[PDB]
Design a protein around this ligand. Structure first.
Ligand SMILES: CC[C@H](NC(=O)CCc1nc2ccccc2c(=O)[nH]1)c1ccccc1
Length: 354
């Protein structure tokens, strides 16, 4: 007979976050923004197998791009059969450049995290048998297996975070800070403790699609087989909020535009600095723990402060960006900070920005 729904334990801010990051509208919006045909690929129909077939088709395309084999056209057509796209019921375009191939890999990585959020929400048999259920938002929070604590104005780190955001965000249209949560994804702790000898820790921005926030809270920042970009197959961070905010896909809610950004503690250790793009990188050179694509600018190092997190000092930039004359000819306007092991980052904060 009828189960009791227990009252929600969550504060309003956290309720809104959990509503947003599991929202079916949000997920379908994201799919439409990536040109996917949501009518032929509904959320409940997404499968790991379908996604795996999509990567196989792109793998075949990539081989063709590097025979008497199938044309890029034919191979593209196969991809589009496996992963339905919407282009106003015109033909979808051929995947015939490295840039576009990577764009499709990135779409599929986002889609794989949407599928993860759907799988996560599957109702277990224990939940079918208990006579009282948590409020749906408590249930969704619990699935993350990630502790979130909303911070108020006088948490020790609050002003330091706000200063990082303000001093390194866009000069004309800085994102407006609404909330900060401390993030404790346990199961990150053990692997991150591995690098406690490794110095040079920095708190760095990671901006993303709203649609991958649940996945990240569940599994941490990840390097996937088809990950790539201007500095290769790693996890990308920025020291300038404005660089990371470029990757934030927010969603219109009422009269404003809501977005989420992370701050991670990154054990950078011995840095290798580059000044030109290298998409082929899969690790730092021998003897180095990270790769920094150095920008024309950097938050003024003289203003760096520190936080203490789990008894370690973590550098937090507090300065506006200034020119770095040694990197004035860099192919990078702003720095990209790369690690190539998922263990070298721990999620620390999540921010809601408008
Ligand atoms: C679009 C694919 C997506 N990656 C991201 O959301 C990271 C985006 C991002 N890139 C950066 C690049 C340089 C500097 C900073 C950033 C950043 O803050 N976010 C992704 C989603 C799921 C699984 C792996 C990767």
């Amino acid at each position: 007979s009828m189960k009791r729904v227990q009252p929600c334990s969550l504060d309003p801010a956290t309720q809104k976050l959990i509503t947003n990051i599991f929202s079916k509208e949000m997920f379908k919006n994201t799919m439409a923004l990536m040109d996917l045909d949501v009518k032929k690929m509904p959320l409940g129909k997404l499968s790991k197998q379908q996604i795996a077939r999509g990567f196989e088709a792109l793998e075949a395309l990539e081989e063709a791009l590097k025979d008497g084999g199938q044309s890029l056209e034919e191979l593209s057509s196969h991809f589009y059969t496996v992963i339905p796209h919407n282009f106003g019921h015109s033909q979808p375009p051929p995947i015939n450049s490295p840039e576009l191939l990577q764009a499709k890999k990135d779409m599929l990585l986002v889609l794989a995290d949407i599928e993860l959020a759907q799988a996560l929400q599957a109702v277990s048999e224990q939940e079918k048998t208990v006579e009282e259920v948590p409020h749906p938002l408590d249930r969704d929070y619990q699935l993350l297996k990630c502790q979130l604590q909303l911070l108020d104005s006088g948490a020790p780190e609050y002003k330091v975070i706000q200063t990082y955001l303000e001093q390194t965000g866009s000069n004309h249209r800085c994102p407006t800070l609404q909330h900060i949560w401390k993030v404790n994804q346990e199961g990150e702790e053990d692997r991150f403790q591995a690098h406690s000898k490794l110095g040079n820790r920095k708190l760095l921005w990671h901006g993303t699609n709203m649609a991958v926030v649940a996945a990240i809270l569940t599994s941490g920042l990840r390097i996937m087989p088809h990950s790539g970009g201007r500095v290769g197959k790693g996890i990308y961070f920025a020291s300038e909020n404005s660089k990371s905010a470029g990757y934030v896909i927010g969603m219109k809610c009422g009269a404003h535009h809501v977005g989420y950004m992370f701050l991670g503690e990154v054990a950078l250790g011995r840095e290798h600095h580059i000044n030109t793009d290298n998409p082929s990188l899969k690790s730092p050179p021998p003897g180095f723990d990270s790769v920094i694509a150095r920008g024309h600018t950097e938050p003024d190092p003289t203003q760096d402060t520190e936080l203490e997190l789990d008894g370690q000092q973590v550098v937090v930039p507090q300065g506006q960006p200034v020119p770095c004359p040694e990197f004035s000819s860099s192919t990078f306007s702003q720095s990209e900070y790369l690690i190539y092991q998922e263990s070298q980052c721990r999620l620390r904060y999540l921010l809601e920005v408008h």
